[PDB]
Amino acid sequence: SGFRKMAFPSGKVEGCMVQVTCGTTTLNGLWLDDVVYCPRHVICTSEDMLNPNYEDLLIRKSNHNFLVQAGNVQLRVIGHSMQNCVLKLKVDTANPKTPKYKFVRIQPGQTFSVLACYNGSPSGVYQCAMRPNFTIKGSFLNGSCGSVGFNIDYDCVSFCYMHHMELPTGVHAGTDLEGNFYGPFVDRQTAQAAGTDTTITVNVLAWLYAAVINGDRWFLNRFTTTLNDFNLVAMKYNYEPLTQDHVDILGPLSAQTGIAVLDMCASLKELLQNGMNGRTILGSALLEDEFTPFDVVRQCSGVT
Amino acid sequence: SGFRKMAFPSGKVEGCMVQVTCGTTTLNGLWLDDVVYCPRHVICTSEDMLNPNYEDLLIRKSNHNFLVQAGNVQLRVIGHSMQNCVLKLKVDTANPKTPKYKFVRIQPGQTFSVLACYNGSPSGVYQCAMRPNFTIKGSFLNGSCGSVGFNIDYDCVSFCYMHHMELPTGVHAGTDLEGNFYGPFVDRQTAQAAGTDTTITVNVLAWLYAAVINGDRWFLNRFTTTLNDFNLVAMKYNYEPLTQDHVDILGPLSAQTGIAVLDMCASLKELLQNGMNGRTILGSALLEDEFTPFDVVRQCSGVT
Ligand SMILES: OC1CCN(Cc2ccsc2)CC1
Ligand SMILES: OC1CCN(Cc2ccsc2)CC1
Secondary structure (H helix, E strand, O other), X not given: OOOOXXXXXXXHHHOOXXXXXXXXXXXXXXXXXXXXEEEHHHHOOOHHHHOOOHHHHHHOOOHHHEEEEEOOEXXXXXXEEEEOOEEEEEEOOOOOOOOEEEEOOOOOOOEEEEEEEEXXXXXXXXXXXXXXXXXXXXXXOOOOOOOEEXXXXXXXXXXXXXXXXXXXXXXXXXXXXOXXXXXXXXXXXXXXXXXXXXXXXXXXXXXXXXXXXXXXXXXXXXXXXXXXHHHHHHHHOOEOOOOHHHHHHHHHHHHHHOOOHHHHHHHHHHHHHHOOOOXXXXXXXXXXXXXXXXXXXXXXXXXX | OOOOOOEOOOHHHHOOEXXXXXXXXXXXXXXEOOEEEEEHHXXXXXXXXXXXXXHHHHHOOOHHHEEEEEOOEEEOEEEEEEEOOEEEEEEOOOOOOOOEEEEOOOOOOOEEEEEEEEXXXXXXXXXXXXXXXXXXXXXXXXOXXXXXXXXXXXXXXXXXXXXXXXXXXXXXXXXXXXXXXXXXXXXXXXXXXXXXXXXXXXXXXXXHHHXXXXXXXXXXXXXXXXXXXXHHHHHHOOXXXXXXXXXXXXHHHHHHHOOOHHHHHHHHHHHXXXXXXXXXXXXXXXXXOOOOHHHHHHHHHOOO
């Protein structure tokens, strides 16, 4: 019993983190097989980041300008290319700790673990969600760029996020491992405002189910609702619309608890309308939206 | 910027987790050098756990009854002893992945990371605090016993917790790695009630400082207080007394923010007396007490 914001074990990713230095900039890279992936803004001086022309800046760079260190051992760079907003540094040595891996581009509302790193060294691990506005609310200081977000399926690491920047509001933006930003953000030191940070409704419901499984039941009410009625309330509270795809995904939690998805919607409706009246659910005073239905099943079933 | 409930990178501990089987019971053990540490209740049948006599149960056990598997490779048990509530299984092979480590007995209010494991396989990592009543609020299903709590200081893992049981209230109890329970709990299937779960005041203050550093400042007020006055309020709200030792430990956070510890106490006083009026601090609607002053400095400074 008990329910925690739980990150994937980080060891498989720890074995992939290296330091990349270009001129006076040091950040993190991800060493998989004989390629090191890092943010392309590693090549940029302060003045460059006003309006950086990455193709033009890279013309001035050679293989030997990219200093790649794995622990205290230097890797030999034998090639480099830009793919969208990431650099791929070909090194002469395959990472011997390379896990089975995939590169995945996640959808908003999907959760993943971040291994926060500085100088290619891990400092900690936490669980994130891709916000509906394609920001993440991370914990990143200078030097943390190139830190990655991932999911693990038994022995296969799915890399979904590489950290590139903090917005002036202190929320975080980055790319998939093909170098494509989540959301409309660009790797430039310019005013970039995030859109509405809405609540991930399907995740809230999953977490309400987690609460019931763990014996927190005070919020279960006598009511039901419809998808359309619930959605009227959801929009009023800056909650994402709930679709039948979301209802389908909640089916196993519905089955285990015997609480119909639309009944749980009516419980969530009353919580939105009434607030929590100073009560807590799984030790939270707000409705938690950074657990997916898959996260709840996994944690509640004990998948390794 | 940003502030997250952050676990230590778990790789060094992942490399220590093995499966221990005695008869039909499988749980986790910790393989350090040529010793595997596990909960002694591995030897117990259902009927044993009413009033188990561990010395008498162990007389019926031999080395070859303890099945120890590290990944898919069996370890040869060449000796076994009981130390308090843990078994130490001497194996013929030193764990080649043994990190620099210490065994530490932590104080209530200290935080640590748990690597939740099943069949010697890691499922996830989260950050805990030892509650003032010497319980932890974990996420543990059947098979998770022998999962460990730890801190990391650069390359040295300090092991502080081994998981042994869930109380009928769904909170967790366990031992240090010398096998001594935190709190008054025993490894027996009997009514055991936890004492008052008070709030770790010094941690709340550390987290208020973290909030200020991250730009969440709405709760800072025009007031100050005294240790005695604050403590009167603290006792009324089931907060741990604050001592000058706690004030001393908050000194670096006081210094960085320029907010005197007793002023932050007066902010916390008003939050206790007034509540949060539907506002949040670092995305929490309650006062977070599972960050130590050391945790706040570490996360806010980027220690690897
Ligand atoms: O000058 C270098 C260090 C600081 N970074 C900041 C940044 C701004 C947009 S994306 C990354 C840029 C490169
Ligand atoms: O029968 C075995 C499996 C279940 N455990 C439960 C337990 C009760 C007190 S401590 C651990 C005991 C041994």
